[PDB]
Amino acid sequence: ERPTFYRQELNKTIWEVPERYQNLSPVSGAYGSVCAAFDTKTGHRVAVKKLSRPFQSIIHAKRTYRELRLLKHMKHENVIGLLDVFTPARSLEEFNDVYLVTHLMGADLNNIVQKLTDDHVQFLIYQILRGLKYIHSADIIHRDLKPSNLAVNEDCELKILDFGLARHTDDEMTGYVATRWYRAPEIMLNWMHYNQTVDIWSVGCIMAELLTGRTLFPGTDHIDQLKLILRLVGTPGAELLKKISSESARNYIQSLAQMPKMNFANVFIGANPLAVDLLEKMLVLDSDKRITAAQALAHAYFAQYHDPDDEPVADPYDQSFESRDLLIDEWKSLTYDEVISFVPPP
Numbered sequence: 001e002r003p004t005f006y007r008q009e010l011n012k013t014i015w016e017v018p019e020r021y022q023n024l025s026p027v028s029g030a031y032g033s034v035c036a037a038f039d040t041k042t043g044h045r046v047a048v049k050k051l052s053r054p055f056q057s058i059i060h061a062k063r064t065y066r067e068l069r070l071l072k073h074m075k076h077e078n079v080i081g082l083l084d085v086f087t088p089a090r091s092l093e094e095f096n097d098v099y100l101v102t103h104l105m106g107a108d109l110n111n112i113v114q115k116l117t118d119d120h121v122q123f124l125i126y127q128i129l130r131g132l133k134y135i136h137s138a139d140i141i142h143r144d145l146k147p148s149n150l151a152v153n154e155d156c157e158l159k160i161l162d163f164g165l166a167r168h169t170d171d172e173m174t175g176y177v178a179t180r181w182y183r184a185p186e187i188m189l190n191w192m193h194y195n196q197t198v199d200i201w202s203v204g205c206i207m208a209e210l211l212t213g214r215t216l217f218p219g220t221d222h223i224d225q226l227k228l229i230l231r232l233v234g235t236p237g238a239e240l241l242k243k244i245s246s247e248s249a250r251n252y253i254q255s256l257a258q259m260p261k262m263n264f265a266n267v268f269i270g271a272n273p274l275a276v277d278l279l280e281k282m283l284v285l286d287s288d289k290r291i292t293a294a295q296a297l298a299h300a301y302f303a304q305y306h307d308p309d310d311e312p313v314a315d316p317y318d319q320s321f322e323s324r325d326l327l328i329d330e331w332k333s334l335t336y337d338e339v340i341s342f343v344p345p346p
């Protein structure tokens with residue numbers, strides 16, 4: 001049966017939500033227009049997001065469908081999942097607003113990055129790689145792993161956030177900005193068609209920062225950041241240069257004086273030698289040669305947490321819709337079907 005809804009004025013608009021959600025209070029806009037609430041059916045504090053103008057254009061309608069498909073698929077301890085999705089509409093004809101419910105995040109990794117022991121670094125990076133093995137097993141690329149997208153609780157337990165939101169703009173990536181400091185060079189500079197290996201570069205940047213307390217590559221712009229990267233890992237050899245499909249980018253790279261890879265034990269002074277070894281296998285310029293998430297879970301650095309019988313993979317994820325061309329009302333009807341078919345977790 002359909003639940004009873006009630007109305008309240010929040011975040012410049014009228015929110016209409018099922019009675020089970022009580023004590024709504026606005027909560028930053030990085031993940032949308034969000035309120036905290038108490039869910040009386042489950043006893044959890046939750047985040048309720050009301051989508052802004054979900055079906056105003058073809059691009060917005062497809063983005064709404066993409067976010068709902070991604071959140072409905074993710075079922076893993078180290079990844080954000082969907083607790084509920086609802087609309088006050090009683091038919092497709094009156095369908096206009098979409099609301100998403102997730103666990104309420106308290107702190108992200110920025111706040112922690114506290115005096116972190118090496119045991120803390122082992123456990124946090126282990127959980128990121130466990131979640132990433134699951135994400136990559138469904139042929140999803142995260143593209144934006146960074147400390148503000150990692151939720152952490154009091155017991156050091158971690159979840160990965162940021163799925164199905166708007167692609168980052170050119171201006172968001174300009175200058176001295178954390179949204180670019182964790183990006184792999186081949187996607188920062190559009191060297192080539194990228195793949196899931198970009199996410200392992202991001203994990204290496206995060207792990208270095210937990211070990212030192214400092215941003216690894218805090219570039220003041222794209223070019224300054226590339227110079228910091230190449231000083232640490234060395235300039236590319238002929239094998240990688242061949243793979244840079246952009247003739248323009250390949251030509252700029254060759255204008256730079258050649259530099260050897262640095263000694264990571266002298267960069268990360270005093271760190272666990274096993275941590276140094278793992279960083280050298282993540283922060284490889286040629287993405288073909290980076291360690292994978294599944295391979296990294298078996299690295300000796302994680303020996304006290306690794307359990308190959310408790311590192312699950314995902315059900316298959318059909319993303320054929322991504323190459324499909326549809327009208328606004330066809331994306332809207334697809335979204336409506338996914339709202340009404342949702343089944344809550346056990």
Ligand SMILES: NC(=S)c1cccs1
Nearest residue numbers: 031049102161162163
């Ligand atoms: N798309 C993401 S990650 C979220 C929606 C509502 C809360 S988080």
Ligand SMILES: [Cl-]
Nearest residue numbers: 003018019020
């Ligand atoms: Cl209810």
Ligand SMILES: [Cl-]
Nearest residue numbers: 079080081103
């Ligand atoms: Cl969750």
Ligand SMILES: [Cl-]
Nearest residue numbers: 089095096097
């Ligand atoms: Cl509606």
Ligand SMILES: [Cl-]
Nearest residue numbers: 146147148178
């Ligand atoms: Cl960040």
Ligand SMILES: [Cl-]
Nearest residue numbers: 138139316317
């Ligand atoms: Cl798949």
Ligand SMILES: [Cl-]
Nearest residue numbers: 316317318319
């Ligand atoms: Cl699917």
Ligand SMILES: [Mg+2]
Nearest residue numbers: 144162165168
């Ligand atoms: Mg993002």
